[PDB]
Amino acid sequence: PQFHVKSGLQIKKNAIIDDYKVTSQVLGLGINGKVLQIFNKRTQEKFALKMLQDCPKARREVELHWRASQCPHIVRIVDVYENLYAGRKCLLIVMECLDGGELFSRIQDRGDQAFTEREASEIMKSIGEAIQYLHSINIAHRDVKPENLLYTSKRPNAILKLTDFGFAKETTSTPYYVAPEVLGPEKYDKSCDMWSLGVIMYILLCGYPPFGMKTRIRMGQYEFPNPEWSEVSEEVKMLIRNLLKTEPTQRMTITEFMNHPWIMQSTKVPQTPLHTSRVLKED
């Protein structure tokens, strides 16, 4: 008998200062709180600390992230503390310190020798299975943006990981013949992750977003303007087109995305160079 099982979420109640040295160095800012760099007193290694005000909404978002941490392409939660900061109660999330910078920053800070079509596909597949894992366990991320994609280290061997579960939500409430519609109700959710994914691929290839701009998005109108898109194949554009469907119910599912040849065969796509890096050094 073999029985694979992992630990549940243990919310530690003791002061974080017992276990960790807390710096005044920032690695992330938002409206909801801050992300600081911390060191483990015992092991002496680098970590990230996300501070949130302790409301039931946050406690669930942590539970979803903790549940998601088993995925190699999702930033892993290590410890969760509930402490008293100021007068208010608050949550303290301990994560693996990702100091490899933002995704587009590292593509731009290459001093580029050009950036290939193949390497962009490798990036996409990794973000793909990050979404695939989430969707497979009924979690929609709902905030997949360039800011929330960070690399582990400064290494050229670094792993890309998806952060920020401040918008993640649970998509759930003989017979192997029944339809998925009859199996309970579900809103849009997962589809918006797929849109974000399509957006990211566009910016990855050329170097600019595809998009009354709020109308041009709702129209689904975007050029593939040259001489950037003159090198990219019809197959790739058709994939972006499938990911950039206006209608959510028409937009490609994650399972279909990962099955697609360009994604599945990350090591078969032509190694044709892109102008991406040059384009980012403008705005």
Ligand SMILES: C[C@@H](Nc1c(Nc2ccncc2)c(=O)c1=O)c1ccccc1
């Ligand atoms: C922008 C975002 N930034 C975020 C992160 N940054 C990391 C940095 C280093 N290592 C791991 C993660 C997260 O995690 C995360 O969420 C943020 C959200 C809420 C509050 C403040 C900031």
